[PDB]
Amino acid sequence: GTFLFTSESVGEGHPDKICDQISDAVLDAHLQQDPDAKVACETVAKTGMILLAGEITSRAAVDYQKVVREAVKHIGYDDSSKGFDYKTCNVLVALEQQSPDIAQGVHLDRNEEDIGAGDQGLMFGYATDETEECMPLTIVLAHKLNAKLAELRRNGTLPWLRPDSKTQVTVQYMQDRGAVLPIRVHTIVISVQHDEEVCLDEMRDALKEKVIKAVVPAKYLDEDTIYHLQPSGRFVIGGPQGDAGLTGRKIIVDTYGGWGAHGGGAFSGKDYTKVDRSAAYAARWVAKSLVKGGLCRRVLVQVSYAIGVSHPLSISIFHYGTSQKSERELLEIVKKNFDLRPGVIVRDLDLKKPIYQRTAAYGHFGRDSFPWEVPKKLKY
Ligand SMILES: C[S@@+](CC[C@H](N)C(=O)[O-])C[C@H]1O[C@@H](n2cnc3c(N)ncnc32)[C@H](O)[C@@H]1O
Numbered sequence: 001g002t003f004l005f006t007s008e009s010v011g012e013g014h015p016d017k018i019c020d021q022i023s024d025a026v027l028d029a030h031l032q033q034d035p036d037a038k039v040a041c042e043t044v045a046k047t048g049m050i051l052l053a054g055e056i057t058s059r060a061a062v063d064y065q066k067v068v069r070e071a072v073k074h075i076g077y078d079d080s081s082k083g084f085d086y087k088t089c090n091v092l093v094a095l096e097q098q099s100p101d102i103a104q105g106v107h108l109d110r111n112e113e114d115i116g117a118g119d120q121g122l123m124f125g126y127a128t129d130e131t132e133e134c135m136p137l138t139i140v141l142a143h144k145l146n147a148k149l150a151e152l153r154r155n156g157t158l159p160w161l162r163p164d165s166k167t168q169v170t171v172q173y174m175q176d177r178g179a180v181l182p183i184r185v186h187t188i189v190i191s192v193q194h195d196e197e198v199c200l201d202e203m204r205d206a207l208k209e210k211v212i213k214a215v216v217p218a219k220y221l222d223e224d225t226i227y228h229l230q231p232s233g234r235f236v237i238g239g240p241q242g243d244a245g246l247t248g249r250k251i252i253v254d255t256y257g258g259w260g261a262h263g264g265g266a267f268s269g270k271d272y273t274k275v276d277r278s279a280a281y282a283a284r285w286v287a288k289s290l291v292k293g294g295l296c297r298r299v300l301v302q303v304s305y306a307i308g309v310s311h312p313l314s315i316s317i318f319h320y321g322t323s324q325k326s327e328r329e330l331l332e333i334v335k336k337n338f339d340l341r342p343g344v345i346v347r348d349l350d351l352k353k354p355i356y357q358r359t360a361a362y363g364h365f366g367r368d369s370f371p372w373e374v375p376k377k378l379k380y
């Protein structure tokens, strides 16, 4: 009855995550001045370069050089010794206005509640009762290991740490009538960029004693737990110098770590009219409301849209057998309690607020009581 499941996470300085954070820093800069800004900002990072490419129609006056460099400074890339420096990197901008064909089909002359979806697509929401925050334990632990590395880098405990990191956690679970119960951590991988002076043995000892032990409860660790710590043996070259980064290349880290399902849409750099973000946040809100409301222990929600059409084209609820109610009854409860038009989701989840850079590392779900993490009281 037992099985293994693995999830990964990455740190703030992983090059794809740098791009997500810059794309959301650009979105927030626009929203601070123009709450109705139409933003579709992609970021690319490679050695010495941040390129912004995409489409923005906004009344805001944004200094892209300052926004980008301040985001890179926050991450910690502040010297050529680390492979990247916010003060001296190249910031290239290839931003145009939003296509007038998209604008006319989606939002021009439309009542806000009746704005069309900004694109077609499918999106999923997922929730599981295995943690209080209703997230899979594998991805929660993977994110916490990266957050711990950033904390020890920033407080000077492990001054040899650099911002680029990856983690991976494999948990052994038991099945329980469709729900899943974590038993133990089977394997942990940690890879983190480091300075040229620290030895491999010091790093491996610190990753076990100051990182893993400070994050994973001992009840999940045993003599058989496998540790792959700095498995490549050397990671001095990192950040965009070691690997090109792009916005929207960590969409599973951003969501459920392989659990549930994904429709393919990236979140970062997009305003609420892009249902890839707003409907995915609403779908998480629905899933978490069903679990916290005691209707099921685990649930997958699918929604889909057509460009220019406000209402979803389809809504589906899958409860893995963890509810006494049928999936059709859960679907009727969802339809009676939620309005998944983007122009209504924006009001319910306050999606014009400039809080998006905060979502762009450590996952968009299970953290900080964001509006989509506060369950809705269901009437039925
Ligand atoms: C291994 S690289 C991807 C493959 C790479 N583009 C290549 O040319 O082979 C992917 C991610 O792994 C991490 N990474 C980079 N250099 C690494 C190293 N020496 N050891 C371990 N992980 C590393 C970084 O987080 C990087 O973004």
Ligand SMILES: O=c1oc2cc(O)ccc2s1
Pocket (backbone or CB within 6 Å): 133, 135, 139, 140, 143, 144, 147, 362, 363, 365, 366, 367
């Ligand atoms: O410190 C952290 O705590 C959590 C909790 C989560 O549920 C997900 C991600 C993180 S990163």
